[PDB]
Design a binder for this molecule. Structure first.
Ligand SMILES: [Mg+2]
Ligand SMILES: [Mg+2]
Ligand SMILES: [Mg+2]
Ligand SMILES: [Mg+2]
Ligand SMILES: [Mg+2]
Ligand SMILES: [Mg+2]
Ligand SMILES: [Mg+2]
Ligand SMILES: [Mg+2]
Ligand SMILES: [Mg+2]
Ligand SMILES: [Mg+2]
Lengths: 114, 127, 98, 151, 96, 206, 79
RNA sequence: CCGGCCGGGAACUCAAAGGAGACUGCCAGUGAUAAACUGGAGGAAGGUGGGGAUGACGUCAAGUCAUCAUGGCCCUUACGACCAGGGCUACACACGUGCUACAAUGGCGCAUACAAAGAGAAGCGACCUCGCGAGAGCAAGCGGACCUCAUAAAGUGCGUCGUAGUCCGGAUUGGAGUCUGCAACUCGACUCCAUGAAGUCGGAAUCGCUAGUAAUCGUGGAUCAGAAUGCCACGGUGAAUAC
């Protein structure tokens, strides 16, 4: 039970199983099981092969997974190349968005030591 | 003529009308059940008919607005024993001992500059 | 047929331009649908009391603002000259038509 | 309590059964003033306990409570340098303000899925004194009695 | 608080109504589904303080730009000074 | 510092209010500035005309303005003359027309403000502060007054290091809300700084 | 990220971009307009962006368009 | 027209002006036949009923010359004045105050009952319509117990999840947008899609609160074009404990 990416998710309600893909955030999963003509609270047992690969197409639509990963990491370089602010920030390991750094910029700045 | 008692508690005001009849109860044009007779204090509207019997001896149609679930069910409860008025002051003595006579004066106490909420005091560290 | 709105911050006063107006009507023409009390809107202004710092100090002032309605049913031209020309009370806001 | 000794508000005996005692129980298990959802969890553990024990409901509670019930406690007493743990014979009325608190508090620190379940499993484990909470008695005993020396 | 820092705010209310509200609503509709010919917004090269929200809001008496209050156009410092001398109609130390 | 202003806490009760007009949110501010603009000019003018208090009202699109003075004539001038040249400018400043009554100050020794003002005006004159304080408190207890306290402050006489020093003669229950207390203020602008005068005058009760 | 209805730019700058287009670039090009959005009609120029103390040179390129002129002129010197 | 909606109705709810009421005063016990406490009576309220306002003489040369004022001192083609851009928002760290969690007393979907208190014309904005959305166009009422903000949330009913770094938790970042404003780069708020850090209840140590309080739950306001987890204010449900 693989669908899309190398990923192989299932064994619980569908809408939640699908989320497993890197590119589905519930909203996408609800639009998928809907456009596939599938009940969202169904497990995969009963979910015979017939319905499964119908989904595999519906997901195929979006730039999910590795292709997403690549695309997204591309966009972060684009910044760094341009040498703009939001980029210089990505290369610096400090928060891009503007969060204060005098304190609590910890997620981005990574755990403390010195 | 209609025999009546007010009864109000914590920001709720209910008006309770009596008339010998069934054991049916209306509130806000609604079944006792359908309003909150299936929630925290359904049993307490009934209360005011304990040492004072019924089951279906007198009817009571009421309304009530303000406050919340237990404030509204508090008022009404007060208005019943206040309307049991009509049926003498001989019954309104163990309506006393029942604690149903009293006006539950406990109000909500104000927020007060310097604190967080009424009593809640901003944690203070020495240094 | 005609009602007059009264407001002022002083209370022991507004109803004495009310009960005054009322009187200056039930004497003349009359009818007058009594003087209605009506929601007293009260602002509150809460401010810091030390020139510098001390956020816990603070004075807490308010401004009550009282109303009265009046309502006069029968408008006699005498009653109509009875508000007119007989009025006063400088710190009272009165509103004629609506 | 420097002076003004006091009495005690007397909450309203349990809306389902008619018991001061459980009203103390619920209020205890209660949290963030959620009485509504509080009494739910107690009767749902009393429901499983009632039938899972058979022997009624009221009386099933009492015999499991009759266990964790304490009789002697160690009251501190910081005197000349030493903290001196002084055992004292504890009141009957407190004797279950605790018992109930250790039972409730025991089921909270527990692995069962829902709180109703946990509660029932403490009631029951205590029923046959072999729980976390009963051990709180088999320890506050141990800790008094050792300071038995003092008296 | 520094004449000039006052004078500034006067110059700003001045301009705030020489142009804006007037000459500047030529932008209100000028920017609303009337699409386009870009000369539209571009026009924004006017005095700067012409804009209303360039105004600060200062204690009418002292000039303090902080602790201001609209009802009374004063700073909490002068407000309480007037309050305790009557001076502000209706206003008294309230309690409840 | 930690004494509620005496006048202020009384307004609701026993004490009046030196502005009484009504206005709504909108003009409420525009009025205040007007008021504090008129009391400004007027006090710089009738300075040496012993004025102790000026009330304002705006009776519908008009401004009334009473002026409590202990030198009614001096304010009024040669047969009305002055009041005219006041009304004149007082309406120029209020943006509306201006009546302007002149209330009389009977027994000025009883007015806190006129009391302070003199004590203030005495230091500038260059007189002993203990002396003035003691004159004040006397002719006061004299003409009635169930009590009075006046205190001063700051470089009393010249000190590099400043002081306060008061004088409580009689009764001055500042905690009783009934108690009539006329409390006011005045500052001396002297060659070695600024001296603050507070005076309380206890008149009665109810 | 804002605007929605007509990207923004300062006049005296946009006319300082056409005093070089029709002409052919001169030396750098000074603007304090860290405001303005960069247009396709600025690619290839070098615009001098004030950062507080002086104007940082910035060659414009095929993707510094939907960005602000200030994005490329660091303002707090940190090390 | 099953809408207090129209006649009407002056009862009731309320509104806001004025009144009575509570005094250890009445019974009793305790205590010097006192003060007082204690318990009982009646009573909406018993022992300054609940809360607020109110802060004595004074202590810390405690804080404020930057709110304003002001003695003295200093600058005066500069220590003053105008403009642009930046900065007060920096980031190896440390400490204080808070917000959000770690979850089934819970998460989520759907249905659904019950507040208080404020705000409003250079404003509150209904409706309808478009947009998944934040919003947008159009447009009524209301200076407002009328009209708008505004559909309280906890809660209750069903169902789902089944103890997992999870359907818990929402950081961080990519993408694309909305509104204010001359202008959202530095640094605004908000939305849609994706993203899913730390975190399984916190060492030493330490804080709050004695009842409509703590805890929990939503609501409004000042400042304010915009910019609240802070501040100020409101009620909902509602404890434990004091020898
Ligand atoms: Mg921190
Ligand atoms: Mg100045
Ligand atoms: Mg501003
Ligand atoms: Mg007192
Ligand atoms: Mg200092
Ligand atoms: Mg000077
Ligand atoms: Mg700063
Ligand atoms: Mg979640
Ligand atoms: Mg927790
Ligand atoms: Mg509350």
């Amino acid at each position: 039970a693989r669908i899309a990416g190398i990923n192989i998710p299932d064994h619980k309600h569908a809408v939640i199983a699908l989320t497993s893909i890197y590119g589905v955030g519930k909203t996408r999963s609800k639009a998928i099981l809907a456009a596939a003509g599938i009940a969202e609270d169904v497990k995969i047992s009963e979910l015979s092969e017939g319905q499964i690969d119908t989904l595999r197409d519906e997901v195929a639509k979006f730039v999910v997974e590795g292709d997403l990963r690549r695309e997204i990491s591309m966009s972060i370089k684009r910044l760094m190349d341009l040498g703009c602010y939001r980029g210089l920030r990505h290369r610096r390991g400090l928060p891009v968005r503007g969060q204060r750094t005098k304190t609590n910029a910890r997620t981005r700045k990574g755990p403390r030591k010195p | 003529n209609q025999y009546y008692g007010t009864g109000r508690r914590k920001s709720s005001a209910a008006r309770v009308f009596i008339k010998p009849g069934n054991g049916k109860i209306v509130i806000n044009q609604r079944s006792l059940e359908q309003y909150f007779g299936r929630e925290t204090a359904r049993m307490v509207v009934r209360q005011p008919l304990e040492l004072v019997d019924m089951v279906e001896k007198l009817d009571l149609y009421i309304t009530v607005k303000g406050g919340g679930i237990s404030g509204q069910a508090g008022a009404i409860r007060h208005g019943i024993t206040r309307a049991l008025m009509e049926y003498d002051e001989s019954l309104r003595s163990e309506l006393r001992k029942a604690g149903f006579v009293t006006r539950d004066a406990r109000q909500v106490e104000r927020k007060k500059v310097g604190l967080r909420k009424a009593r809640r005091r901003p944690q203070f560290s020495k240094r | 047929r005609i009602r007059i709105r009264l407001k002022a911050f002083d209370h022991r006063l507004i109803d004495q331009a009310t009960a005054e107006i009322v009187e200056t009507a039930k004497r003349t023409g009359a009818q007058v649908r009594g003087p209605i009390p009506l929601p007293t809107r009260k602002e509150r202004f809460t401010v810091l009391i030390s020139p510098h710092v001390n956020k816990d100090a603070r004075d807490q002032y308010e401004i009550r603002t009282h109303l009265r309605l009046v309502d006069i049913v029968e408008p006699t031209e005498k009653t109509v000259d009875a508000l007119m020309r007989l009025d006063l009370a400088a710190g009272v806001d009165v509103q004629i038509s609506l | 309590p420097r002076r003004r000794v006091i009495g005690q508000r007397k909450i309203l005996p349990d809306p389902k059964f008619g018991s001061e005692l459980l009203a103390k129980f619920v209020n205890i298990l209660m949290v963030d003033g959620k009485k509504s959802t509080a009494e739910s969890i107690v009767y749902s553990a009393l429901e499983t306990l009632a039938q899972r024990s058979g022997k009624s409901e009221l009386e099933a509670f009492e015999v499991a409570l009759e266990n964790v019930r304490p009789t002697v406690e160690v009251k501190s007493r910081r005197v000349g340098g030493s903290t001196y743990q002084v055992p004292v014979e504890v009141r009957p009325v407190r004797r279950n303000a605790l018992a109930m608190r250790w039972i409730v508090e025991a089921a909270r620190k527990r692995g069962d899925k829902s709180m109703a379940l946990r509660l029932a499993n403490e009631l029951s484990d205590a029923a046959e004194n072999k729980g976390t909470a009963v051990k709180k008695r088999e320890d506050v005993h141990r800790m008094a009695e050792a300071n038995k020396a003092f008296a | 608080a520094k004449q000039s820092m006052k004078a500034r705010e006067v110059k700003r209310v001045a301009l705030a109504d020489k142009y804006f509200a007037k000459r500047a609503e030529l932008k209100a509709i000028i920017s609303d589904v009337n699409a386009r010919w870009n000369a539209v917004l571009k026009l924004q090269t006017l005095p700067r303080d012409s804009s209303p929200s360039r105004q600060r809001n200062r204690c009418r008496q002292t000039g303090r730009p902080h602790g201001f209050l609209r009802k009374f156009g004063l700073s909490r410092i002068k407000v309480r000074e007037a309050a305790m001398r009557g001076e502000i109609p209706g206003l008294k130390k309230a309690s409840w | 510092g930690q004494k509620v202003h005496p006048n202020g806490i009384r307004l609701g009760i026993v004490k009046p209010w030196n502005s009484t007009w009504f206005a709504n949110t909108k003009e409420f501010a525009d009025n205040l500035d007007s008021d504090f603009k008129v009391r400004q000019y007027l006090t710089k003018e009738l300075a040496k005309a012993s004025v102790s208090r000026i009330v304002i009202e705006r009776p519908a699109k008009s401004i009334r303005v009473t002026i409590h003075t202990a030198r009614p004539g001096i304010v009024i001038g040669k047969k009305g003359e002055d009041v005219e040249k006041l009304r004149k400018v007082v309406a120029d400043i209020a943006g509306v027309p201006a009546q302007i009554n002149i209330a009389e100050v009977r027994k000025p020794e009883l007015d806190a403000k006129l009391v302070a003002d003199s004590i203030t005006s005495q230091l500038e004159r260059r007189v002993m502060f203990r002396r003035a304080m003691k004159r004040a408190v006397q002719n006061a207890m004299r003409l009635g007054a169930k009590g009075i306290k006046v205190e001063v402050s700051g470089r009393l006489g010249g000190a590099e290091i400043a002081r306060t020093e008061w004088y409580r003669e009689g009764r001055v229950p500042l905690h009783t809300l009934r108690a009539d207390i006329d409390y006011n203020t005045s500052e001396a602008h002297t060659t070695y700084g600024v001296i603050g005068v507070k005076v309380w005058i206890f008149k009665g009760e109810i | 990220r804002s605007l929605k209805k007509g990207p923004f730019i300062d006049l005296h700058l946009l006319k300082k971009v056409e005093k070089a287009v029709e002409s052919g670039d001169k030396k750098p090009l000074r603007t304090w307009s860290r405001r303005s959005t960069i247009f396709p009609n600025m690619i290839g120029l070098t615009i001098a962006v004030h950062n507080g103390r002086q104007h940082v040179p910035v060659f414009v390129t095929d993707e510094m368009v939907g960005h602000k002129l200030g994005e490329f002129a660091p303002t707090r010197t940190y090390r």
